[PDB]
Ligand binder design. Structure first.
Ligand SMILES: *[C@@H]1O[C@H](CO)[C@@H](O[C@@H]2O[C@H](CO)[C@@H](O[C@H]3O[C@H](CO)[C@@H](O)[C@H](O)[C@@H]3O)[C@H](O)[C@H]2NC(C)=O)[C@H](O)[C@H]1NC(C)=O
Ligand SMILES: *[C@@H]1O[C@H](CO)[C@@H](O[C@@H]2O[C@H](CO)[C@@H](O[C@H]3O[C@H](CO)[C@@H](O)[C@H](O)[C@@H]3O)[C@H](O)[C@H]2NC(C)=O)[C@H](O)[C@H]1NC(C)=O
Ligand SMILES: *[C@@H]1O[C@H](CO)[C@@H](O[C@@H]2O[C@H](CO)[C@@H](O[C@H]3O[C@H](CO)[C@@H](O)[C@H](O)[C@@H]3O)[C@H](O)[C@H]2NC(C)=O)[C@H](O)[C@H]1NC(C)=O
Ligand SMILES: *[C@@H]1O[C@H](CO)[C@@H](O[C@@H]2O[C@H](CO)[C@@H](O[C@H]3O[C@H](CO)[C@@H](O)[C@H](O)[C@@H]3O)[C@H](O)[C@H]2NC(C)=O)[C@H](O)[C@H]1NC(C)=O
Ligand SMILES: *[C@@H]1O[C@H](CO)[C@@H](O[C@@H]2O[C@H](CO)[C@@H](O[C@H]3O[C@H](CO)[C@@H](O)[C@H](O)[C@@H]3O)[C@H](O)[C@H]2NC(C)=O)[C@H](O)[C@H]1NC(C)=O
Ligand SMILES: *[C@@H]1O[C@H](CO)[C@@H](O[C@@H]2O[C@H](CO)[C@@H](O[C@H]3O[C@H](CO)[C@@H](O)[C@H](O)[C@@H]3O)[C@H](O)[C@H]2NC(C)=O)[C@H](O)[C@H]1NC(C)=O
Ligand SMILES: *[C@@H]1O[C@H](CO[C@@H]2O[C@@H](C)[C@@H](O)[C@@H](O)[C@@H]2O)[C@@H](O[C@@H]2O[C@H](CO)[C@@H](O)[C@H](O)[C@H]2NC(C)=O)[C@H](O)[C@H]1NC(C)=O
Ligand SMILES: *[C@@H]1O[C@H](CO[C@@H]2O[C@@H](C)[C@@H](O)[C@@H](O)[C@@H]2O)[C@@H](O[C@@H]2O[C@H](CO)[C@@H](O)[C@H](O)[C@H]2NC(C)=O)[C@H](O)[C@H]1NC(C)=O
Ligand SMILES: *[C@@H]1O[C@H](CO)[C@@H](O[C@@H]2O[C@H](CO)[C@@H](O)[C@H](O)[C@H]2NC(C)=O)[C@H](O)[C@H]1NC(C)=O
Ligand SMILES: *[C@@H]1O[C@H](CO)[C@@H](O[C@@H]2O[C@H](CO)[C@@H](O)[C@H](O)[C@H]2NC(C)=O)[C@H](O)[C@H]1NC(C)=O
Ligand SMILES: *[C@@H]1O[C@H](CO)[C@@H](O)[C@H](O)[C@H]1NC(C)=O
Ligand SMILES: *[C@@H]1O[C@H](CO)[C@@H](O)[C@H](O)[C@H]1NC(C)=O
Ligand SMILES: *[C@@H]1O[C@H](CO)[C@@H](O)[C@H](O)[C@H]1NC(C)=O
Ligand SMILES: *[C@@H]1O[C@H](CO)[C@@H](O)[C@H](O)[C@H]1NC(C)=O
Ligand SMILES: *[C@@H]1O[C@H](CO)[C@@H](O)[C@H](O)[C@H]1NC(C)=O
Ligand SMILES: *[C@@H]1O[C@H](CO)[C@@H](O)[C@H](O)[C@H]1NC(C)=O
Lengths: 147, 224, 342, 433, 49
């Protein structure tokens, strides 16, 4: 404006108007695309607040690596941090196992848990922690003949 | 994809056929023409193009005589029944030249040799198809052509198939053309076909050898 | 390369481009942003195990026949039978394989479209994880599943007999485990027949992997459009950049060229926006596919219709070009009788 | 180069894009048809007379060398105006079909010879189309062709029934009628012989004295050439990067002998992007492929700058044998030739990787190269020791076969309670403009 | 209709539009892409039986 007439200053300025207006249109499009990506993260974070903090989730690896116990939310700048608490099984032993016990023509299955042998005796144990119990009509149920 | 003056697909070409029967009529030439003859032994020999044909304004001539060519544009006075006489060369040859009485102010001329060779070796009744396109656009008259020796259809005409015309010649003639006419020899059994070009988007397929091998007339039907 | 796309092999156009400058760097940074996202998506979906499990040499699993979803060692690529079908359904364009130039030029320069895109500075980059490394992760997930069930997801892999794994599953869908062992040969014959129909379907019909072919066709269409946009005149005297500098003075050649610069730069801005919108759609699919890897392969999901139509038993992952295929196994109840109840 | 790309003095650990490498041409090449005679320009510019503008004369110029300079040096004919080219390029370029249109008009009507103009000279006897490619030349002829008794053998059509078409000529001499009645024969009321004359006498006022005009109407750059500017053909060369010119078609590329069968009427071939990618040579009739000179992306692989300054380079999509041929005896876009020494060069499937050493043992992926390869900065000392960039095929995880058997189970006798962090974005900064 | 929107009932503007060409076809294809997505969304939500 300090170096041209209103007739061709309008050509030099309309370029700067066109280029700068295109620069804002690019920024708003780039912001809308990120805002859509951040929203998707907020919808996930609200779902984890509901399913990992307000409850216990049986969904595998949704509330951290392991079996989900409890989670604790912590605030952070523009985000949320979840401290997930998980039970992880640690010291395994090999056992021999069987699908059923045959006792008296009748076949027996575990009520809950699985049959195991240390090599000489047989027990029922719960699946996810070794706590052996003598095989009984209270630990098991019957169906069909052994054959 | 290209927009040019092209012959619309499946369009009614007008069909002309000599025997003692002759058909030398003057036809309109609006935007430009596709002209073809199914032909033996050279009966068709060229064309007149113009607006008045009687020297009050110029007109174009193309001819293939016995051993060569003439192309000229001039204030001709054309003969109202233009023709040549040969009767299969039975006992006499080229003699009379019934095409014009006068050629006043002329502004381009050209001469060459015997235009458009026959098929080699012959075969039983084996005729050949001559195809041409003529356009007139801001002073330039543009000629495109093809020749295909092909087996004769009997009750039928203008045979099914596809082939593209190569560009032949460009004449800087500078004249309004509105009407045109065809030159023939005096019997024979030639037939010829006339179609009109129109502005029309064509989608062309080129094979890996770069010959056009198929096309779609984009205005023909909804599938096209 | 915005410079070779806009100013194709022209020195003086490149100097007019610098008056915009940063505008090309935004495009380069945005496309690099999408490219790193593709590797991250593939890690989230497939790299869900920190150990590569192998299946033992005794290929027996209570009569269930995994021999068509497990690796076949005889093939040079270690994919399965079903993966080697999936890799033939999706006809790719350019896995970023290097061009030794003699394969770009000569006979192939007449018909190949990938070399023609490359000569306009458009380049497809290779994935970080090759199809053999995706086949190895898929083999590890599968070998873990058939030898140890959900346990390799929650800790170290713990072996269990496969029929006892299927009994634990049956209890998971509320059917008492004796209903497996009393029917095991039938349940295995049904599973073996159902896996047989996957090969038959994928060997017979073209209209199956359309969800993956569409992703290839979208990228191929977007680059073919972006090459074709170089034909646009944008109100200049010509498309051909040379035919402007060969016919004008530096004072008004700059008007004819600035049009082509403005129009071609707008064509790249449109492509990058269109790529970011798809990359957001593909990401959403990768986040779902990682969630299905976790909840249908590494576990059994009680979520209705999440792991296929029925009650979920087990799922097996298979790799495919730019995707994953889940073979979900479901118990479906079949022959009902009316009873009176109270 | 990474410091300037990122605009920083410190570069973090990573692989970074930088400016594409491009091979520059080693020589310029020019080809034109070997037409040796200078064109018959002077055969019109100093000649008997020019036609009456109602019947303007058209000459075809061909099979000759144009030289506008030697004519303008001779000719007293001191004017120029161009429309499809700059005058400065006319010496550089070449032309397909060239017609000089020759006629005479008044000095003030010269402006009507520009394309898109109107007024009876432009409407009824000579018209240029809106897309006319060419130039208009004019000069005063009063010194030679104006006469004090007059030189009335210059004529122009004042009347016509409609405006004529571009490059049409009309020599009809039938009468014209402005009265609505049939003025048949030689004359009538408000009815006219359509041609008039010019009062060219030397004592007239400026712009009424006679100007001889020539309009040159050349076609160019897309059809087989017949008239070229006076520059000289070089030798031809193949398989090397060159600044070529064929018939005025300037470009940088590598030429090669082709099996594309151009038909006799063709001169150039083009790709889907509307650019010339083949061209028959105007001297020896063979078809040449045109390919852009070898080029590609350049990625720089670095540890963090505060860890080290040594870096490796990936020439993406490039066969390694090309990089030793990219030796800086000529120019290239990247000036930093030193990486060409190699000795530790590796062909990855993603490109030629230079300055990183390939090692047979796997690791977790530190910097991702592509196609299963990754690079890292570490002490390569398997057998004095030093840090270097290595490259390796990435590990996927530890190898672990499972001890499965048709009656064996593993059950955990103990557990770990583990706490793990997970971090999720919830928002971004609000902004207004 | 990009022609109708840009060059509203003008013949000669329509001929200047063709110098851009493909730019309108990208718009038509993109809006057709959204339109097929709406039917697919409605099938995924309601046609679960
Ligand atoms: C498998 O686990 C079994 C249960 O823990 C274990 O058997 C138990 O072994 C102890 C000795 O270590 C026995 O103790 C008995 O010793 C004598 C037996 O005559 C009695 O005087 C004692 O009062 C006492 O009962 C347990 O009774 C015995 N339990 C049973 C059910 O027999 C096995 O040793 C383990 N086997 C292996 C291979 O580790
Ligand atoms: C086919 O017809 C052509 C014209 O219809 C004819 O061309 C004619 O050729 C003759 C001989 O060359 C010319 O005669 C003149 O030739 C020069 C002119 O300077 C003079 O020495 C002669 O005295 C005589 O004036 C004709 O002018 C010429 N006609 C035209 C209009 O071109 C061919 O010769 C014919 N060819 C055959 C095989 O029939
Ligand atoms: C593109 O143009 C090519 C060159 O003219 C043309 O190749 C030619 O094709 C014919 C028909 O296939 C071959 O004919 C011969 O084929 C075998 C030997 O290859 C013989 O059994 C036959 O008897 C016969 O001799 C030509 O040999 C072949 N020429 C060359 C140089 O390979 C292509 O067919 C054209 N492309 C298209 C799509 O039409
Ligand atoms: C698991 O399911 C597999 C697919 O049905 C099945 O593989 C198929 O087994 C048969 C019988 O061995 C093979 O039949 C071929 O046998 C030899 C191979 O050299 C040929 O001489 C015969 O003519 C015949 O074609 C099939 O080829 C084979 N198919 C595949 C894809 O390998 C397994 O046998 C099943 N396993 C169990 C334990 O049932
Ligand atoms: C090329 O020549 C054409 C014919 O010589 C010429 O077309 C002619 O134009 C005039 C004026 O428009 C017409 O004159 C008649 O106009 C209408 C009927 O058309 C009547 O109301 C008038 O009273 C008068 O009779 C001619 O009828 C017409 N002839 C034809 C065949 O179209 C073109 O204008 C010429 N074009 C150029 C570019 O020179
Ligand atoms: C289940 O896992 C527990 C670890 O997560 C383990 O607890 C650890 O037990 C050992 C002894 O077996 C302790 O070792 C220390 O014991 C005393 C000091 O307290 C010293 O004499 C030893 O030298 C040694 O320093 C660990 O400190 C202890 N860790 C914790 C966190 O308590 C249980 O023993 C395991 N239980 C079973 C049933 O396997
Ligand atoms: C579970 O058993 C496997 C292998 O089977 C055992 O083989 C004998 C040695 C004996 O332990 C039997 O009761 C079993 O039948 C164990 O796998 C071995 O592990 C060691 C390292 O600890 C390794 O050197 C061997 O090569 C492995 N062999 C095989 C065939 O895998 C496994 O370690 C046992 N699990 C636990 C928790 O101890
Ligand atoms: C469950 O019962 C319904 C209808 O009730 C029965 O009606 C009698 C015929 C008898 O079966 C009673 O024990 C029940 O109270 C059955 O529905 C009918 O199905 C047939 C075809 O199989 C059809 O022609 C009838 O029109 C149906 N009638 C009605 C009222 O729906 C149904 O088929 C039975 N379910 C099964 C698994 O057999
Ligand atoms: C890089 O290009 C060279 C050619 O310059 C390739 O070397 C060729 O390899 C093939 C297959 O072994 C041979 O048949 C040729 O004779 C070789 N040509 C020459 C001149 O060496 C090389 O293989 C290419 N490298 C890569 C990785 O593609
Ligand atoms: C068209 O041709 C005729 C005949 O050649 C020309 O008429 C003659 O022109 C000359 C030269 O001007 C005169 O000397 C004669 O007297 C004219 N004869 C007649 C009978 O008119 C006419 O000039 C030409 N027209 C054009 C436009 O070239
Ligand atoms: C062709 O001509 C016939 C009359 O002989 C007519 O019925 C037909 O509709 C015409 N078709 C076209 C496309 O002009
Ligand atoms: C002009 O042309 C004539 C021949 O017509 C020639 O004799 C004369 O020398 C030329 N004059 C000039 C100034 O070149
Ligand atoms: C160039 O011209 C000379 C003589 O005019 C001729 O001998 C030579 O063959 C021409 N060049 C080519 C490539 O034909
Ligand atoms: C980088 O290294 C320098 C020492 O060379 C050290 O002072 C600085 O704190 C380091 N910064 C980081 C972020 O590691
Ligand atoms: C990798 O090991 C092989 C032997 O298995 C050896 O020949 C080769 O030289 C080693 N690789 C490199 C890069 O030296
Ligand atoms: C496992 O038992 C099956 C019988 O169910 C037998 O066919 C197979 O050989 C046995 N294999 C091993 C390794 O024990």
């Amino acid at each position: 404006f300090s170096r041209l007439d209103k007739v061709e200053a309008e050509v030099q300025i309309d370029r700067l108007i066109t280029g700068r207006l295109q620069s804002l249109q690019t920024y708003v499009t780039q912001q809308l695309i990120r805002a859509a990506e951040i929203r998707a993260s907020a919808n996930l974070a609200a779902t984890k607040m509901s399913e990992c903090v307000l409850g216990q989730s049986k969904r595998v690896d949704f509330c951290g690596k392991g079996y989900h116990l409890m989670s604790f939310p912590q605030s952070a700048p523009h985000g949320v941090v979840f401290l997930h608490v998980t039970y992880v099984p640690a010291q395994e032993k090999n056992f021999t196992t069987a699908p059923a016990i045959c006792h008296d023509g009748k076949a027996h299955f575990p009520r809950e848990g699985v049959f195991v042998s240390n090599g000489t005796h047989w027990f029922v144990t719960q699946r996810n922690f070794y706590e052996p119990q003598i095989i009984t009509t209270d630990n098991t149920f019957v169906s069909g003949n052994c054959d | 994809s290209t927009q040019d003056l092209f012959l619309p697909f499946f369009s009614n070409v007008t069909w002309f056929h000599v025997i003692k029967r002759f058909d030398n009529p003057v036809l309109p030439f609006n935007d430009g023409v596709y002209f073809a003859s199914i032909e033996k032994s050279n009966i068709i020999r060229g064309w007149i193009f113009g607006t008045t044909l009687d020297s009050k304004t110029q007109s174009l001539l193309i001819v293939n005589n016995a051993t060569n060519v003439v192309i000229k544009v001039c204030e001709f006075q054309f003969c109202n029944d233009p023709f040549f006489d040969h009767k299969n060369n039975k006992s006499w040859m080229e003699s009379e030249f019934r095409v014009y009485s006068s050629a006043n102010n002329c502004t381009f001329e050209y001469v060459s040799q015997p235009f458009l060779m026959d098929l080699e070796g012959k075969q039983g009744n084996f005729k050949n198809l001559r195809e041409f396109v003529f356009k007139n656009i801001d002073g330039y008259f543009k000629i495109y052509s093809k020749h295909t020796p092909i087996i004769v259809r009997e009750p039928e005409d203008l045979p099914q198939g596809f082939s593209a015309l190569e560009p032949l010649v460009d004449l800087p003639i500078g004249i309004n053309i509105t009407r045109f006419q065809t030159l023939l020899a005096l019997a024979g059994a030639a037939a010829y076909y006339v179609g009109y070009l129109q502005p029309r988007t064509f989608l062309l397929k080129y094979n890996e050898n770069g010959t056009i091998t198929d096309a779609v007339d984009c205005a023909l039907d909804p599938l096209s | 390369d915005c410079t070779m796309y806009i100013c194709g092999d022209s020195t003086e156009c490149s100097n007019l481009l610098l008056q915009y400058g940063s505008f090309c760097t935004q495009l380069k940074r945005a496309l690099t942003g999408i490219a790193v996202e593709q590797d991250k998506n593939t890690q989230e979906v497939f790299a869900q195990v920190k150990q590569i499990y192998k299946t033992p040499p005794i290929k027996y699993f209570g009569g269930f026949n995994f021999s068509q979803i497990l690796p076949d060692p005889s093939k040079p690529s270690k994919r399965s039978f079903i993966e080697d079908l999936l890799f033939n359904k999706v006809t790719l364009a350019d896995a970023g394989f290097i061009k030794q130039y003699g394969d770009c030029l000569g006979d192939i320069a007449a018909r190949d479209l990938i070399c023609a895109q490359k000569f306009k500075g458009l380049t497809v980059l290779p994935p970080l994880l090759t199809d053999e490394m995706i086949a190895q992760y898929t083999s590890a997930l599968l070998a873990g599943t058939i030898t140890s069930g959900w346990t390799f997801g929650a800790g170290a892999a713990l072996q269990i007999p496969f029929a006892m794994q299927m009994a634990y599953r049956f209890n998971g869908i509320g059917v008492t485990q004796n209903v497996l062992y009393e029917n095991q040969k039938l349940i295995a014959n049904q599973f073996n027949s159902a896996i047989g129909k996957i090969q038959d379907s994928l060997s017979s019909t073209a209209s199956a992997l359309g969800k993956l072919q569409d992703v290839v066709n979208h990228n191929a269409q977007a680059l073919n459009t972006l090459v074709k946009q170089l034909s646009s005149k944008f109100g200049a005297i010509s498309s051909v950049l040379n035919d402007i500098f060969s016919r004008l003075d530096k004072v008004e050649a700059e008007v004819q060229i600035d049009r082509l610069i403005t129009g071609r730069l707008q064509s790249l801005q449109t492509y990058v926006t269109q790529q970011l919108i798809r990359a957001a759609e593909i990401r959403a699919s990768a986040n779902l596919a990682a969630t299905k890897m976790s909840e249908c392969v590494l576990g059994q999901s009680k979520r209705v219709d999440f792991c296929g139509k029925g009650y979920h038993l087990m799922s097996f992952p298979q790799s495919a070009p730019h995707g994953v295929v889940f073979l979900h196994v479901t118990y479906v109840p079949a022959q009902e009788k009316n009873f009176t109840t109270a | 180069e990474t410091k300037c790309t990122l605009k920083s003095f410190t570069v973090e650990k990573g692989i970074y894009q930088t400016s594409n490498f491009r091979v520059q041409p080693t020589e310029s090449i020019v080809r034109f048809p070997n037409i040796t005679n200078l064109c018959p320009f002077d055969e019109v510019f100093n000649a008997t007379r020019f036609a009456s503008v109602y019947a303007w004369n058209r000459k075809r110029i061909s099979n000759c060398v144009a030289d506008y300079s030697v004519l303008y040096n001779l000719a007293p004919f001191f004017t120029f105006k161009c429309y499809g080219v700059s005058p400065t390029k006319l010496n550089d370029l070449c032309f397909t079909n060239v017609y000089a249109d020759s006629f005479v008009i008044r000095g003030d009507e010269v402006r009507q010879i520009a394309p898109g103009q109107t007024g009876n000279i432009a409407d009824y006897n000579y018209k240029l189309p809106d897309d006319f490619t060419g130039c208009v030349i004019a000069w005063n002829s009063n010194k030679l062709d104006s006469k004090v008794s007059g030189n009335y053998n210059y004529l122009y059509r004042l009347f016509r029934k409609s405006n004529l078409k571009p490059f049409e000529r009309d020599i009809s001499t039938e009468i014209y009628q402005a009265g609505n009645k049939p003025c048949n024969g030689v004359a009538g009321f408000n009815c006219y012989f359509p041609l008039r004359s010019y009062s060219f006498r030397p004592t007239y006022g400026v712009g009424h004295q006679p100007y001889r005009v020539v309009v040159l109407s050349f076609e160019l750059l897309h059809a087989p050439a017949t008239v070229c500017g006076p520059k000289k053909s070089t030798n031809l060369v193949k398989n090397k990067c060159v600044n070529f010119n064929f018939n005025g078609l300037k470009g940088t590329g590598v030429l090669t002998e082709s099996n594309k069968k151009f038909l006799p009427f063709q001169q150039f071939g083009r790709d889907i992007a509307d650019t010339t990618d083949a061209v028959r040579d105007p001297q020896t009739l063979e078809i040449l492929d045109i390919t852009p000179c070898s080029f590609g992306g350049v990625s720089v692989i670095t540890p963090g700058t505060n860890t080290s300054n040594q870096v490796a380079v990936l020439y993406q999509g490039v066969n390694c044998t090309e990089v030793p041929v990219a030796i800086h005896a000529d120019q290239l876009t990247p000036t930093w030739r030193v990486y060409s020494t190699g000795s530790n060069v590796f062909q990855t499937r993603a490109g030629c990787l230079i300055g990183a050493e390939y090692v047979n043992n796997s690791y977790e992926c530190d910097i991702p190269i592509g196609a299963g390869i990754c690079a890292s900065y570490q002490t390569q000392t398997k057998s004095v020791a030093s840090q270097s960039i290595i490259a390796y095929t990435m590990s996927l995880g530890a190898e672990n076969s499972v001890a499965y058997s048709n009656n064996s189970i593993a059950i955990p006798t103990n557990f770990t309670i583990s706490v793990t962090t997970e971090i999720l974005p919830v928002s971004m900064t609000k902004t207004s403009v």
